[PDB]
C-alpha cells in the first residue's frame, strides 16, 4: 500500500487532517479524516489543479466535520499522482465555490 496525509492549516480556526490510503497502485484511494474549527455549514475539499472538488462535507454544531470516501479517479502514484499537490478546504460546497479556509500539501507516510 501507499499512504499519505495532508495536514490542513490556515490563519483562522480551521484545521484538519486528511488521510489517503491506496491498497494497490491500480486500485481506488480511500480518503478519510476530519476538520475542526468550522462554523456549522457545508464545505468542500479540492486538490490544486483538479477542476472539481474531491468531495464535500457538512459540519457539526461543534464546528467538526468527518470525511470518509472512495475515489477511483485519483491515485497516489503514477505521473498523475496527487502526492505533493495541495489539498484545500473551502467555503460553500463546489469546485470554485468559496473562499479558502485551510490547506496542506499531501505528503507521503
Swiss-Prot record:
The protein (both wild-type and ALS1 variants) has a tendency to form fibrillar aggregates in the absence of the intramolecular disulfide bond or of bound zinc ions. These aggregates may have cytotoxic effects. Zinc binding promotes dimerization and stabilizes the native form. Zn(2+) binds at residue 53. Belongs to the Cu-Zn superoxide dismutase family. Cu cation binds at residues 46, 48, 90. It is linked to Amyotrophic lateral sclerosis 1: A neurodegenerative disorder affecting upper motor neurons in the brain and lower motor neurons in the brain stem and spinal cord, resulting in fatal paralysis. Sensory abnormalities are absent. The pathologic hallmarks of the disease include pallor of the corticospinal tract due to loss of motor neurons, presence of ubiquitin-positive inclusions within surviving motor neurons, and deposition of pathologic aggregates. The etiology of amyotrophic lateral sclerosis is likely to be multifactorial, involving both genetic and environmental factors. It comes from the Eukaryota. Destroys radicals which are normally produced within the cells and which are toxic to biological systems. The modification N6-acetyllysine is found at residue 92. The modification N-acetylalanine is found at residue 1. Its cofactor is Cu cation; Zn(2+). It catalyses: 2 superoxide + 2 H(+) = H2O2 + O2. The keyword Oxidoreductase applies. Its EC number is 1.15.1.1. PANTHER family: SUPEROXIDE DISMUTASE CU-ZN -RELATED (PTHR10003). Changing residue 45 to C: In ALS1; slow progression. A lipid is attached at residue 6 (S-palmitoyl cysteine). It is found in: Cytoplasm; Nucleus. The modification Phosphoserine is found at residues 68, 72, 75, 77. This is Superoxide dismutase [Cu-Zn]. One of its GO terms (molecular function) is zinc ion binding. PROSITE patterns: SOD_CU_ZN_1, SOD_CU_ZN_2. Its main location: cytoplasm. There is a cross-link at residue 32 (1-(tryptophan-3-yl)-tryptophan (Trp-Trp) (interchain with W-33)). It comes from Homo sapiens (Human).
Amino acid at each position: 500500500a501507499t499512504k499519505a496525509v495532508a495536514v490542513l492549516k490556515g490563519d483562522g480556526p480551521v484545521q484538519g487532517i486528511i488521510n489517503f490510503e491506496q491498497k494497490e497502485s491500480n486500485g481506488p484511494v480511500k480518503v478519510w479524516g476530519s476538520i475542526k474549527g468550522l462554523t456549522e455549514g457545508l464545505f468542500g475539499f479540492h486538490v490544486h489543479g483538479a477542476g472539481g472538488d474531491l468531495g464535500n462535507v457538512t459540519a457539526d454544531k461543534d464546528g467538526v466535520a468527518d470525511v470518509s470516501i472512495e475515489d477511483s479517479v485519483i491515485s497516489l502514484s503514477g505521473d498523475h499522482s496527487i502526492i505533493g499537490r495541495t489539498l484545500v478546504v473551502h467555503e460553500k460546497a463546489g469546485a470554485g465555490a468559496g473562499s479558502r479556509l485551510a490547506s496542506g500539501v499531501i505528503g507521503i507516510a
